Write a protein that binds this ligand. Structure first.
Ligand SMILES: O=S(=O)(c1ccccc1)N(CC(F)(F)F)c1ccc(C(O)(C(F)(F)F)C(F)(F)F)cc1
Length: 225
């Protein structure tokens, strides 16, 4: 009920990202020149699928390991029952990772940050599902064509978690309110930055779900972590 407490929420959510920026954007941009040479690439291609999926599920579990803190520094988040605190992240934290990967994306050369270097999707010929791989590349490519800002990722990823239509919740009405205040806080900073035009350039609500869902099956056929 105050412009201060609304901006305070905006300023808060952006602070949670700055620490849970798993990667340093400065390093990401400064290392965008250091690229897996075709010799160094060819090493990854030999590995059987059972290797990369582990390496992938390792970094992903490590990447999620920074989403878990981020979720907990949000206003009123611990004021939920553990039921309505586990139901959220299991469905939500996965989609947050796919977002933060846009930071690690260089749409100039269509490359992504993998184990200290940048590499294309031929770095993943071993897995055997390039269509899913490419769809992730073009998805992150659909957020480089928006030139996202740090506080735009922090404010959108935060509204990926805070969904009240997640089944299994119990304190539902208690989640809607916290989602209301994040919708308005999101639109507000968009207005006061003249970036509200992207509200339609967004990938839909259903694209994010059908992406990692279509993948996490395959990650679970192998590692299941
Ligand atoms: O950003 S990643 O480098 C990545 C590379 C290629 C395709 C997707 C994502 N990495 C996140 C981290 F920074 F931790 F490395 C990541 C790797 C792989 C995944 C996958 O879960 C998979 F398939 F390998 F298991 C997938 F992208 F497919 F979902 C997710 C995130």
């Amino acid at each position: 009920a105050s412009l201060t407490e609304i901006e305070h929420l905006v300023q808060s959510v952006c602070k949670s990202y700055r620490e849970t920026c798993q990667l340093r954007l400065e390093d990401l941009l400064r290392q965008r020149s250091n690229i897996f040479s075709r010799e160094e690439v060819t090493g990854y291609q030999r590995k059987s699928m059972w290797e990369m999926w582990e390496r992938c599920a390792h970094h992903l579990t490590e990447a999620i390991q920074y989403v878990v803190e981020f979720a907990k520094r949000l206003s009123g988040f611990m004021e939920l029952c553990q039921n309505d605190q586990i139901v959220l992240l299991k469905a939500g934290a996965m989609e947050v990772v796919l977002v933060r990967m846009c930071r690690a994306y260089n749409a100039d050369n269509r490359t992504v940050f993998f184990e200290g270097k940048y590499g294309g999707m031929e770095l993943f010929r071993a897995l055997g599902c390039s269509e899913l791989i490419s769809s992730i590349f073009d998805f992150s490519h659909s957020l480089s064509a928006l030139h996202f800002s740090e506080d735009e990722i922090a404010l959108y990823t935060a509204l990926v978690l805070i969904n009240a239509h997640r089944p299994g919740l119990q304190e539902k009405r208690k989640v809607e309110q916290l989602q209301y205040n994040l919708e308005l806080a999101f639109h507000h900073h968009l207005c006061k930055t003249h970036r509200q035009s992207i509200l339609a350039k967004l990938p839909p609500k259903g694209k994010l779900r059908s992406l990692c869902s279509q993948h996490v099956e395959r990650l679970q056929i192998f590692q299941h972590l």
